């Protein structure tokens, strides 16, 4: 039953040999981690390299730097659709092998790694995703899903802030499932000297000091260890000889950089011995490594499982919120909303229409999961259960200020499956979760980013609360919507649009200070859904208004200024710009009509609304300067945004 | 032998303050004023008639919801703060706004707003008298020599950036930091044993201090400064909202609650109104003059030392007067001996003429180990105090960007830092932050494009560089080779209110500066390479684009067809220029294509009349050669051609 040196070599053999190929990659982790990587997927991991997709393998996540040959040599000698020719082209086009691995299309990569520490908070969401649904179905009689969380983690990972962050709440949520392996191979002590196991502890974590990464036995132990906790997760603290098998290059960090070079590589092979050339491996070894009988047995297994869940009372959801399917009465709902809004508007804030809709969507989707991250602006509805206080039925998580971890183990919890996660905290604090943000586009997750207080209009907090840059600079992010409602009407139809999408993440934008409504007729309901449309639609028109969110009702002000002096405008309200450049260019002009000048009214940085400017010309209305702490009403008129100045701008023109 | 009294005199002010502001928070002020109290009127060394002074301990108050002790404190000590501008807390104008502002209100030592980065700029603070100290002091003659401290509350412990600032003050020693923890009244989300975590990073921590009890704060405030070796937090239990019987335990209280307060804690004062003997408690003026008027003294020993005259230079932020001739015979040698460098490598080789001749600059990356921020000079303080100009960070951009910021604060110091441009996501809103303070902070980007190539979309900017541009005051520079690289920190290090950010590529190019005439121009952010009476279209580019410019503008010369190239380095510099110098370099009746391995959505605002086309990304990176990257997103001489082509 013991392990050989050999088995784990062909790990170390793969990472040398594939990265010497490709002139790019590092090799030294690889080596460093091999001995551990062998003990937990050939011995523990339950998982079906036939199907990467079983809903109830174990997850494996590998949170650390450089070392991605690591993974492509699991999947690979597992018996994964990864071949020895995918390896010989490791960082070239369109391969399964990029420098670092990316969720998506390579069989078994779960995540999309390269950004320090975002590893680890993902596999915090993963999980919490196992939690929230083995609470949701399984029953005393049923088990259908249960499940490990693996993590491999490094130095790095420990630095950054986001590992303080997912860990500290980690620790408070008691995932015990979840068990992390520390790559302990340390130049660190310069910038590094953290006590880790003392910081973990501190975080409620069950730590395990001391574990030899180079023996396989111990390695073992250790796992087993963190497999008897009931209520805290792991960190496994793994020494280990980065390099290791090489001669020259075992220890140095600079085995952490460059390939080895042919006589490095012929001297491991000695050292180690090694008796195969490059890319090549025995029979004997891919004999013990593939996991495909297995891997078929296990899941045959659970599958017994899954028919006794057949017909069950929640089988049905079960089904539906895997296939990522909305439920059938959603749509009815959504139009009995919009009616009772038509027939009694109200004036209310955004971040209060969109804690509305909230009743109406959670209502209707169990795999709603909601969140803040606060000391919770309108992401709660009246039937929030907090994870915080309670485990039965918990569909909502405070996650303390927290707002890059939070929105990296929402990127965790979509992957998982079976949950449509969003979370809120004010505009300005998504500079803090921007990459996180980036990574859901890249992912093409369906985050819902929820982004209060969104302009200077939130008064007195100030500059350094108010946002400026930031609606414009997330709408550069490629793959995310940046949807910014007027009112009630058009923040149901972009709520409608943020969880329909397969694909593509969300920005909900709202106000924190109370706006009139504009959405007057069921036409333009539909019209909403296309990110732009009019919301004065005027056949003599001599020029257009074109705004977003809070400025709609100041361009409808001006519009009916002008109806008073006989001279009709358009009004166009374009609620999210990515969307709206998606539609056909008959449209597109029909909205601002290419013929009669437009003026762009937006309080934010308007530099990206020339794009859209008509042949008939205008200008643009925003704010190039950082804001100031007063009233509201005070920062309108400092910064123009006041009927009387937006009319001197169009009278300019008419 | 303090009064209550004399503490619940910031209670009161910020409770007036907040119900006539009908915004804001008295809760925190409440809590924490007992210690506040015992910290300014007993060991606080400060002059309130000269909140610049150099030799001063520095304060920071971290935490959020509780500008009204500070504005209290600053108040009742004697600085030009009033009565009057406390009845104007949060209005147009004012010196009181809701979060404190360094630059106008006086004594105030930074602006902070969003959570964990007033930690991170006290670290900065502490670093900066630890670095100032090793360069001027002798054995003999103390010339910096002070504290700095911090408050902070429970989200600050939360925030990511707290971790990467406190694990690095342990790492580095700073004894004469303290920090101070409004440990009050949810374990739901927050459960961390903070004394342990601190233990952890290296602090000296004193857990259970009693924040009501002026005795134990005293106590536990001369048991920091004992600490030779670490940093020091202090773990003080308050009762927030603490003197009120209805809420003790962020609204302002209504009439009736604050009429209840003032009964309880036996205030027997209006609103506002303060009492002779509290002003005779807390006014330092006196104190405060003599303090000062002493180490005028201290600091006048030392003009007879080799290193006065540099001293009292760089606490000027005045450049040496040797610096442009240095960088001009730079760039005339640049002309004379062109090389085909990647701009990371120009950018050393810049800091190498500048980190010689300017003490004051001090560099430093975020990482395990291509930024290229170090020179042949550089000492790390990781390893060496003696003599240290840089610092290598570890894998903290945040926490980094953050410190940078508290260094450039804290005076006598440029710092600069490097790390991946793709990681400013990390660091964005220390960056801002530099920006709304008018810190000159250079954040030096590396890896600026897909043309870093293998490593992938995780690692290629595409919305960066226009997501930074978008930041109010921050230039943007994207410098083309060694020259443009040249002139760019150059105007980097003489901008006195303006942080700048300095994007670098991994990949070679080629020179494009041909004379002393475009030399002139580069400073203005925007310039022709190619500049042709007859020209048909202008190519704008920036950075690695602009040798791909001047290659499809030479196909076309071969077929009798000219075109004009521009160059603009600085977009934001570019816009400042006179209107009819813009219209020039973009001729406005001929069309242009704006060439930029970036989203490009930016560039319809300076579209000549005569029309033209954006070529950028809109699209995430992919891992691959970069020659194979250039030819998937259409960088190439033939796709470009093919673009003019349909001008011409």
Redesign the interface.
């Given at each position: 039953l013991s392990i050989p040196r050999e088995f784990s070599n062909a790990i170390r053999f793969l990472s040398i040999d594939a990265t010497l190929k490709?002139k790019?990659?590092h090799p030294g982790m690889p080596m460093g981690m091999a001995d551990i990587a062998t003990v937990l997927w050939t011995k523990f991991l339950k998982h079906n390299p036939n199907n990467p997709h079983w809903i109830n393998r174990d997850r494996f996540v590998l949170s650390n730097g450089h070392g991605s040959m690591l993974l492509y040599s699991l999947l690979h000698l597992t018996g994964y659709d990864l071949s020895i020719e995918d390896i010989k082209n490791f960082?070239?086009?369109?391969?399964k092998t990029?420098?670092?691995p990316?969720y998506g299309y390579t069989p078994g990569v779960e995540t999309?790694?390269?950004?320090?520490?975002q590893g680890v908070a993902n596999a915090v969401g993963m999980a919490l995703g196992e939690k929230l649904l083995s609470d949701r179905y399984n029953t005393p009689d049923l088990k259908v899903i249960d499940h490990h969380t693996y993590v491999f983690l490094g130095?790095?990972?420990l630095?950054?802030?986001?590992?303080?962050?997912a860990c500290?709440?980690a620790?408070?949520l008691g995932l015990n499932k979840l068990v992390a392996f520390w790559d302990d191979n340390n130049?660190?002590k310069?910038?590094?000297?953290?006590?880790?196991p003392?910081?973990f502890?501190?975080?409620?974590w069950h730590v395990i000091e001391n574990v030899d990464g180079h023996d396989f036995v111990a390695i073992e132990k250790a796992i087993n260890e963190a497999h008897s906790q009931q209520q805290k997760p792991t960190l496994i603290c793994c020494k280990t000889v980065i390099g290791f098998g090489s001669p020259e290059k075992a220890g140095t960090?600079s085995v952490?950089?460059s390939p080895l070079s042919d006589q490095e590589r012929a001297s491991a092979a000695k050292e180690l011995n090694w008796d195969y050339q490059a890319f090549e491996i025995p029979q004997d070894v891919y004999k013990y490594w593939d996991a495909r009988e297995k891997g078929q047995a296990l899941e045959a297994n659970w599958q017994g499982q899954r028919n006794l869940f057949k017909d069950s009372p929640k089988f049905d959801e079960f089904e539906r919120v895997l296939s990522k399917e909305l439920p059938v009465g959603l749509e009815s709902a959504i139009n009995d909303y919009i009616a009772s809004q038509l027939s009694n508007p109200v004036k209310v804030a955004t971040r209060k229409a969109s804690q509305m809709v909230l009743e109406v969507l959670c209502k209707n989707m169990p795999e709603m999961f909601g969140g803040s991250a606060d000391?919770s602006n309108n992401t709660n509805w009246s039937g929030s259960v907090?994870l915080?206080?309670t485990q039965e039925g918990a569909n909502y998580l405070?996650?303390?200020?927290?707002e890059?971890?939070m929105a990296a183990i929402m990127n965790g919890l979509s992957l998982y499956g079976g949950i449509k996660p969003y979370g809120g905290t004010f505009l300005?604090?998504s500079?803090?979760s921007?990459?996180a943000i980036?990574?859901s586009?890249?992912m093409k997750q369906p985050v819902v980013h929820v982004m209060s207080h969104d302009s200077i209009g939130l008064?007195?907090?100030?500059?350094?609360?108010q946002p400026?840059?930031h609606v414009?600079?997330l709408?550069?992010?490629?793959?995310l919507s940046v949807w910014r409602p007027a009112d009630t009407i058009e923040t149901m139809i972009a709520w409608k649009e943020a969880v329909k999408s397969k694909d593509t993440p969300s920005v909900m934008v709202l106000t924190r200070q109370n706006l009139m409504p504009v959405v007057q007729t069921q036409h333009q309901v539909a019209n909403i859904a296309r990110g732009g449309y009019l919301v004065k639609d005027n056949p003599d028109a001599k020029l257009t208004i074109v705004a977003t969110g809070s400025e709609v009702e100041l361009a409808v002000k001006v519009a009916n200024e002008f109806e008073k002096k006989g001279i009709k405008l358009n009004v166009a309200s374009i609620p999210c710009v990515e969307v709206f450049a998606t539609q056909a260019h008959e449209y597109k002009k029909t909205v601002i009509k290419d013929d009669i000048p437009a003026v762009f009214v937006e309080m934010a940085?308007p530099?990206?609304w020339?794009?859209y400017?008509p042949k008939a010309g205008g200008e643009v209305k925003g704010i190039?300067?950082?804001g100031?702490?007063?009233?509201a009403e005070?920062?309108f008129k400092?910064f123009g945004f006041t009927v009387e100045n937006i009319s001197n701008i169009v009278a300019k023109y008419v």
């Open positions: 490709a790019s990659g960082r070239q086009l369109h391969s990029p420098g670092h990316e999309t790694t390269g950004p320090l520490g130095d790095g990972c630095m950054e802030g986001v590992s303080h962050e500290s709440l620790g408070t130049d660190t310069g910038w590094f000297s953290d006590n880790t003392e910081r502890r501190a975080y409620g960090a952490h950089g000391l907090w915080n206080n405070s996650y303390g200020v927290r890059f971890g300005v604090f500079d803090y921007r990459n980036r990574m586009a890249l008064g007195e907090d100030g500059p350094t609360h400026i840059e414009p600079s709408r550069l992010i490629p793959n940085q530099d990206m020339y794009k400017m190039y300067s950082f100031e702490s007063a009233p005070d920062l400092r």
